[PDB]
C-alpha cells in the first residue's frame, strides 16, 4: 500500500551522508556481535573498518527505507545506492 514500486522510485540514487553514517555505524555494531561478514577480512579487524570494506564493495546487507512526507516509502538496498 504505502510501498513504492522499484520502477516508480523518484528519490536520489546516491547514498546520503546521513544514510552512510547510520549504515556504517549500524553495520559496525552488527559485526561486533558476530554477524556474517560478506567480504574477506585481512589485517583491518575493527568493526568500523570491516563495515567500510563491505561498503566499498557494495556488500553491506542493509536497506534504506526512505519515508516521504505523506508516509509512503521507497526501499533502497545499499548494494544499489551509489557511493562516492
Amino acid at each position: 500500500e504505502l510501498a513504492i514500486l522499484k520502477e516508480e522510485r523518484t528519490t536520489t540514487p546516491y547514498l546520503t551522508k546521513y544514510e552512510r553514517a547510520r549504515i556504517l555505524g549500524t553495520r559496525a555494531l552488527q559485526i561486533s556481535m558476530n554477524a556474517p561478514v560478506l567480504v574477506d577480512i585481512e589485517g583491518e579487524t575493527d568493526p568500523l573498518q570491516i563495515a567500510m570494506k563491505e561498503l566499498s564493495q557494495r556488500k553491506i546487507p542493509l536497506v534504506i527505507r526512505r519515508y516521504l512526507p505523506d508516509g509512503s516509502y521507497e526501499d533502497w538496498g545499499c548494494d544499489e545506492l551509489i557511493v562516492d
Partner: protein
C-alpha cells in the same frame, strides 16, 4: 541492559493523547486513599497507612521494596493515591475557561444558548479545530442573556426561559449578576464550584462537542476538582539536612495543608457552623488546592512556608530556564563528559585533541569483546583502572559489571565473546569537543584523541577560529560516544575536516593564523 527483563513488548511513543482526568478515573488508578495529615505512624517509626507516605505509594528507600509492585526503588515508578474533597473547588488553571463555558450555556438546565437553527451559530460548529470552535461559539452565546424555550405554530427547542447572568471574575470566585425586570435591582449571587459542577454535568454530548470539549477525554465538569490525585513520593522526596534530620518536600507539606483544610470543611457542616465561618473555611480549601498547583496567582498573596519563602508549586516546577522542560528535557547533565583549560599545540594535527592522562583514565568506552580484540582487551584489564592503557569495568551479557578497582585476581578474568570491556580512552578514539557559547555547528566538532601529559586540552591553532577559542583561561568540554553507532556519527559527520567549509557563507571557517600567518609572510 541495565533494565531487568520484562516480557512486555518494547515500543516507542507515537502519539500523546491529552485530556483531563475524570473523578472516576482518578479513583480507578489509585492504590490507596489519603485521609490522615500525620505523615508518621505516631513518631514510632514507619509511615502511617492512609498517610501521605503510605508505602503503597511506592518505595524511595534502598532496603524496602514497594508494597504495591514488589520492585526495588530503582524499578518502582511510584503509584498514585487519591484524596476525596469534602467540597468541590475550582482548578486554578481553568477558572477563566469555566467562566467562558458558563456564559455559553444556560445556568439552569445546561443547554447551549444557541442552536444550529441560527445560521451564524451553524457556521461556528463547522470549525474542525476544538479550540477555534469553542471561541467562535463563545463569541456568539456570551451576549445571549435568556435561554429561549421556542425556536425563533409553536416549535420548542427545549429551553426553560430563564434569564442568563453576567459573569465576572473576582480572584478565585465567579459572580453572576441577573438583571430582574425598566431598570430595577440586580442580585449577584456566588457561582460556587458545586453549583457549576451540577450544571456542567447536564451539558449534552452533542453540546459538549459544539463547545470544543470531548466526551471521553475532556469533559467540561472535569475542570472542577472533587477528588485530588495524590502523587507518589518519587514526585516529592524528602531530604536529610544533617544525617539524622529530614525535611519534607514543599508538595508534601502543601498536600498536608489541603488534607487539614479538607477535614475542617467536614467539621463545620455537621456541627458548630456560624455560616460566615463556613464560607471562610471552604474558601481556605480552595486556596490550598489552588496554590498547590499555581502559586503565582495575580492579585493575591502567595502561599508561604514558615521560613517565609513562597511555596514551590507544580506550575513553577515546569516553567522557565531551570524548569522541567528547558532544564531537564531539552537539555540535561550527562555522563562521560569532561572539562579543563585549553592550550595551543603547533605539533598536533588539525583534527586532534590532546587529552590529559588523568581524564583519559576516568573516561571510558565499552568495547565489545570479539575474537579480534580479546587479547588486546585482556591486557587492558590486567593493567586496571589506574594504569594507561587500562580498563575500569567488565560487563557480562547479563549486565553485571565487574569493578576492576576491587578485583584482586584480575589476572584470573577470562573474557567471553559478546562481553564488553569499559577500557580507558585511547589514541584516535573519536570524541565531541565543544566551546561555549555554542553559536553554530562547528562549536561542536569531533576530534581524534591524543593522550598527553599535563592537564590542559590541546588544540591545533587553526581550530581556534570556529570555536572562538583562545588560551587566556578559556575552558572547553569533551564528550565520549558510547557505541559503534554514535562513534560513527562523530567520525563520519562531525569530524573537524568535514567542517572546514561552512554553509553559512559558502567559504572556509578555518585558516592560517597568528605565528604561522605572520611567519608565512
Amino acid at each position: 541492559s541495565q533494565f531487568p527483563y520484562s516480557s512486555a513488548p518494547l515500543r516507542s511513543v507515537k502519539e500523546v493523547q491529552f485530556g483531563l482526568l475524570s473523578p472516576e478515573e482518578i479513583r480507578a488508578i489509585s492504590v490507596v486513599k489519603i485521609e490522615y495529615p500525620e505523615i508518621m505512624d505516631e513518631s514510632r517509626q514507619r509511615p502511617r497507612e492512609g498517610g501521605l507516605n503510605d508505602p503503597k505509594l511506592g518505595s524511595i528507600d534502598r532496603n524496602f521494596k514497594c508494597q504495591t509492585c514488589g520492585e526495588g526503588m530503582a524499578e518502582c515508578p511510584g503509584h498514585f493515591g487519591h484524596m476525596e474533597l469534602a467540597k468541590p473547588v475550582f482548578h486554578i488553571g481553568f477558572i477563566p475557561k469555566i467562566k467562558k463555558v458558563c456564559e455559553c450555556i444556560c445556568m439552569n438546565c445546561g443547554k447551549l444558548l444557541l442552536d444550529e437553527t441560527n445560521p451564524t451559530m451553524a457556521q461556528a460548529i463547522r470549525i474542525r479545530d476544538p479550540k477555534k470552535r469553542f471561541n467562535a461559539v463563545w463569541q456568539l452565546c456570551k451576549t445571549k442573556m435568556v435561554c429561549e424555550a421556542d425556536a425563533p405554530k409553536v416549535v420548542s427547542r427545549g429551553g426553560c426561559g430563564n434569564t442568563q447572568p453576567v459573569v465576572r471574575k473576582d480572584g478565585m470566585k465567579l459572580w453572576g449578576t441577573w438583571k430582574k425586570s425598566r431598570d430595577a435591582q440586580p442580585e449577584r449571587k456566588l457561582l460556587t464550584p458545586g453549583e457549576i459542577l451540577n450544571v456542567f454535568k447536564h451539558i449534552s454530548p452533542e453540546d459538549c462537542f459544539r463547545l470544543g470539549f470531548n466526551e471521553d477525554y475532556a469533559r467540561p465538569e472535569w475542570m472542577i476538582i472533587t477528588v485530588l490525585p495524590v502523587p507518589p513520593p518519587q514526585v516529592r522526596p524528602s531530604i536529610a539536612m544533617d544525617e539524622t534530620t529530614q525535611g519534607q518536600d514543599d508538595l508534601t507539606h502543601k498536600l498536608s495543608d489541603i488534607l487539614k483544610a479538607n477535614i475542617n470543611v467536614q467539621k463545620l457542616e455537621m456541627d458548630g457552623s456560624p455560616q460566615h465561618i463556613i464560607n471562610e473555611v471552604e474558601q481556605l480549601l480552595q486556596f490550598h488546592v489552588a496554590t498547590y498547583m499555581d502559586n503565582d496567582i495575580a492579585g493575591q498573596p502567595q502561599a508561604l512556608q514558615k521560613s517565609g519563602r513562597p511555596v514551590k508549586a507544580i506550575r513553577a516546577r515546569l516553567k522557565g530556564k531551570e524548569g522541567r522542560l528547558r532544564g531537564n528535557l531539552m537539555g540535561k547533565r550527562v555522563d562521560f563528559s569532561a572539562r579543563t583549560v585549553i592550550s595551543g599545540d603547533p605539533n598536533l594535527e588539525l583534527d586532534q585533541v590532546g587529552v590529559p592522562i588523568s581524564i583519559a583514565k576516568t573516561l571510558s568506552y565499552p568495547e565489545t569483546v570479539t575474537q579480534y580484540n580479546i587479547h588486546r582487551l585482556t591486557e587492558y584489564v590486567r593493567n586496571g583502572p589506574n594504569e594507561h592503557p587500562g580498563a575500569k569495568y567488565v560487563i557480562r551479557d547479563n549486565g553485571d559489571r565487574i569493578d576492576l578497582r576491587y578485583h584482586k585476581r584480575a589476572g584470573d578474568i577470562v573474557l567471553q565473546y559478546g562481553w564488553k570491556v569499559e577500557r580507558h580512552l585511547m589514541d584516535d578514539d573519536p570524541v565531541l569537543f565543544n566551546r561555549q557559547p555554542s553559536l553554530h555547528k562547528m562549536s561542536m566538532m569531533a576530534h581524534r584523541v591524543k593522550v598527553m601529559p599535563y592537564s590542559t586540552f590541546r588544540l591545533n591553532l587553526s581550530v581556534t577560529s570556529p570555536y572562538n577559542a583562545d588560551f587566556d583561561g578559556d575552558e572547553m568540554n569533551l564528550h565520549v560516544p558510547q557505541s559503534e553507532e554514535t562513534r560513527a556519527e562523530l567520525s563520519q559527520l562531525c569530524a573537524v575536516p568535514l567542517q572546514i567549509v561552512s554553509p553559512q557563507s559558502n567559504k572556509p571557517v578555518m585558516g592560517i593564523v597568528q605565528d604561522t600567518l605572520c611567519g608565512v609572510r
